[PDB]
Design a protein around this ligand. Structure first.
Ligand SMILES: C[C@H]1C[C@H](C(=O)O)CC[C@H]1C(=O)N1CC[C@@]2(S(=O)(=O)c3ccc(F)cc3)c3ccc(C(F)(C(F)(F)F)C(F)(F)F)cc3CC[C@@H]12
Length: 252
């Protein structure tokens, strides 16, 4: 690739990201004072474990749908084979949502935007997965310290998705080229903006993997106690990724 081609890739990755966010960042920043009252927090804590799990799996499904759309807009992704597109979204969709999450997090009061207002960790106490919630809030807190611009999140999340080391890849070399080009775009943009200092501070790659394993372990626990809740009231896309639908979303 040449220099005008690296810069063109930067702009298309940033444009693809802005167009595939479930929530506008302007809306998220203007809502920061709209915080759940102690009575509203108590209502969430008093909801049944299964009711909280259904709501959260539904919110994760909506966010993963926007990540599927982001992947379809990344140059090179639809040029990969269907097996590879599916391998990458199955391994990387949750990881992308985990990074995106920091836009809806407020490190000033340790709250997250959930169902119209901001609330802390204690809002998810009914889920019965305290350590997973803690890890999610800590990971968001650690990304907030980086003060990412939207362009930085866009370039980083494209790299979280386009990972050539994913087990199951048929055309490994084609994914390596796409990843190398997105790496040049990310590093070029960081070099240009005098932001290469964030490289050393980016979360290690076993951290995203650990967060994803915790999610699948806690879901197995919930599913064992409530198998009919999962079968009857969990979204089909959630069950395909974590317990088909990807083939339809990708063709569309
Ligand atoms: C804001 C939204 C839209 C943005 C955009 O695109 O604009 C991109 C980010 C996206 C987002 O942050 N999210 C999408 C849904 C949401 S959540 O908001 O429901 C929420 C629940 C629990 C929590 F700790 C914190 C938040 C979510 C849902 C369920 C789980 C579970 F693993 C867990 F942890 F609950 F167990 C699980 F297991 F339920 F799946 C984790 C998360 C973390 C990411 C969150």
């Amino acid at each position: 690739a040449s220099l005008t081609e690296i810069e063109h890739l930067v702009q298309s990755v940033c444009k693809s990201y802005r167009e595939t966010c479930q929530l506008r960042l302007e809306d998220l920043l203007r809502q920061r004072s709209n915080i759940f009252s102690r009575e509203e927090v108590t209502g969430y804590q008093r909801k049944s474990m299964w009711e909280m799990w259904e709501r959260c799996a539904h919110h994760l499904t909506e966010a993963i749908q926007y990540v599927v759309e982001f992947a379809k807009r990344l140059s090179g992704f639809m040029e990969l084979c269907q097996n590879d597109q599916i391998v990458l979204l199955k391994a990387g969709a949750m990881e992308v949502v985990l990074v995106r999450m920091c836009r809806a997090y407020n490190a000033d009061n340790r709250t997250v935007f959930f169902e119209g207002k901001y609330g802390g960790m204690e809002l998810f106490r009914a889920l019965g997965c305290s350590e997973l919630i803690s890890s999610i809030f800590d990971f968001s807190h650690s990304l907030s310290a980086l003060h990412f611009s939207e362009d930085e999140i866009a370039l980083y999340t494209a790299l979280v998705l386009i990972n050539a080391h994913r087990p199951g890849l048929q055309e490994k070399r084609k994914v390596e080229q796409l990843q190398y080009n997105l790496e040049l775009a990310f590093h070029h943009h960081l070099c240009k903006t005098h932001r290469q200092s964030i490289l050393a501070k980016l979360p290690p790659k076993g951290k995203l993997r650990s967060l994803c394993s915790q999610h699948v372990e806690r879901l197995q626990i919930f599913q064992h106690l409530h198998p009919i809740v999962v079968q009857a009231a969990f979204p089909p896309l959630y069950k395909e990724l974590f317990s088909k639908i990807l083939h339809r979303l990708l063709q569309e």
